[PDB]
Symmetry: C3
Subunit: 262 residues, 3 copies
């Protein structure tokens, strides 16, 4: 085997990054973060690259979320040499070039956070979104807790965040959270077509427009810093809780968890 966690390939002036763990529903671990993060860095630096598409290998999963076995090992999910890029080497990894998530199937928790972190999203009609973290005693630590209400109407975002219940591709599109819903199996082609609608434009204009729209000073999205800081503060406490143990233990034991609030 020895296949990398993520592949990178070039379709003309678009870099296509494919999460490459279908045997594990394309869940994020450190190996995926290395593949994705390095490819994004290459995309940033190669002036022949005009856009990036992120997708998942196979026909069922974009990204099922953070790898639960890695969490259980109390293992870092991020690029080991680039903690500053966050989850998947992606969610706190600003690049000047447009990013499009091509959501080929399940996109729960971490998968939805990858969508939120992308500029644009095209989804297979079968794709499901959501932030179910609150059902397991953790939280959407990869940006979801503070970005969801930035990209969906506040009340709609709060229902998703607090219930942990999923959202169809159609409902995601209706709220303005993803851009387009496409026929089963066509998500990569559709995303490359959207990429083409951007890459025909003036590169310096697209790059400058991105930096201004996200409030970027020196490669950092300034406005996200308090969100990251608050998320990190809360996770530190939560990862120390008895309930964060019970969530996984209960799921495995096929019983409802019994929460203690400690």
């Amino acid at each position: 085997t020895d296949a990398p966690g993520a592949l990178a390939e070039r379709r003309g002036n678009v870099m296509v990054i494919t999460i490459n763990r279908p045997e594990a529903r394309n869940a994020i671990n450190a190996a995926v973060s290395i593949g994705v993060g390095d490819a994004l860095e290459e995309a940033q630096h190669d002036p022949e690259v005009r856009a990036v598409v992120l997708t998942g290998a196979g026909d069922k999963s974009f990204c099922a979320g953070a790898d639960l076995k890695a969490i259980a090992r109390r293992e870092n999910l991020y690029h080991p040499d680039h903690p500053e890029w966050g989850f998947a080497g992606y969610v706190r990894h600003f690049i000047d070039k447009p990013t499009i998530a091509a959501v080929n199937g399940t996109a729960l928790g971490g998968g939805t956070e990858l969508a939120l972190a992308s500029d644009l999203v095209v989804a297979d009609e079968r794709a499901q979104f959501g932030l179910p973290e609150v059902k397991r005693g953790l939280i959407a630590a990869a940006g979801g807790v503070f970005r969801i209400a930035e990209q969906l109407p506040r009340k709609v975002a709060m229902r998703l965040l607090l219930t942990g219940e999923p959202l169809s591709a159609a409902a995601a599109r209706d709220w303005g959270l993803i851009n387009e819903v496409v026929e089963a199996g066509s998500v990569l082609d559709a995303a490359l077509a959207l990429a083409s609608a951007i890459t025909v434009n003036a590169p310096l204009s697209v790059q400058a427009s991105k930096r201004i729209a996200y409030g970027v000073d020196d490669g950092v999205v300034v406005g996200d810093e308090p969100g990251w800081d608050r998320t990190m503060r809360e996770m530190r406490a939560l990862l120390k809780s008895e309930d964060a143990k019970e969530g996984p233990r209960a799921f495995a034991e096929k019983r409802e968890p019994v929460w203690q609030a400690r």
Copy 2:
């Protein structure tokens, strides 16, 4: 002849009911004391995993600030907790989820209670809106700065500047509220929504809420400029002749002096 608001348990939910149906459940100090105290009790009671806010009866959730009490110089907030704001509710952050069960009219202050809630479920007959501008006042209970945070900017500005109402169906379509339900069933629908949250990990829910609202040291810090600007405008506005003329106007058109 009754308390301004009631608090009761439905399982692990505290239901807080505004209890002035003869005054269309308008907010005065008596309501603010009851609501505020019930919220603070909810916050520290481990048996309580969610809060539902609703109005007594089949007609009104909350018609707004009590204008009779407004005319008569009486403060509307909790006298021991001015910092909780209008109805003891709109500047009273709690960790636990809050659901407005809007059983009828929800105008001005009433819409501001919805804005202050995490989630909103509404009776099909419910109306929202911010008619303060028609009465020579403003939406001082958070409405002026929160409306554009929860609706698209242009849609919000139209509501704010015209003072015209918004139907329950329209609020739902815009994503200002979560669900519209059949007449009479709003409390059971809110309780169902509460159960979709309370099955989840409490510390997860509680942390998600703090992060999502940007809470540090129990306060929504991002709201401070809005409250400060509201307070300065409101103080200045209450001295204007138009702020007197508006409330008084005997079912006739007001005549504005811009003074």
Copy 3:
């Protein structure tokens, strides 16, 4: 002829961009006309609302005047650079502003709509930020305001593709308030003005100052966006691509970008 006209319709000042032969594109003459009228409206207590529209039946405003840009002319009000593009986009006033979009509203024209409190549009109107197709950017507030007024993902598609949005689609997202029958946009705008001007003027004015976060006359929350926009635009205007884009559009051909 002045770049903008101003008339009264009751207690409403109607400002009309007056370069129909240039698709009502913005130059310094328009900024002078619009900016002066806005400030007159601010200080005349008989004026309770303002409507901004374009002359003719084809265009509200097709954008920044491209010949003026090619000459490196300033497009703003010579006496009031602080008001920004069209003497409008950084010119806060107390009183409600309604853009009555009678047709094409692209680039600068969409930026006028973004800067207005409310927007009513002719069914034929198109919105969009095609600056990215001409090697420039929406420097008149579009780059940072578009995601404030449309859902982030929808905004980012508009911004990065440069492709337009129909009046109906803009209304469906809540970017504008209403879509009306061809030719009726001014009447629709006046009707909406009336829905506001009957209200208490002190209340309306205070509601505006709070909703936009106005302190000591300054819309303070927009400062970082203006500052980033300004620093980027100055760097962009020095690139060959910023000259190629408009040259290519003038020459009816595809551009060849160099990333410089």
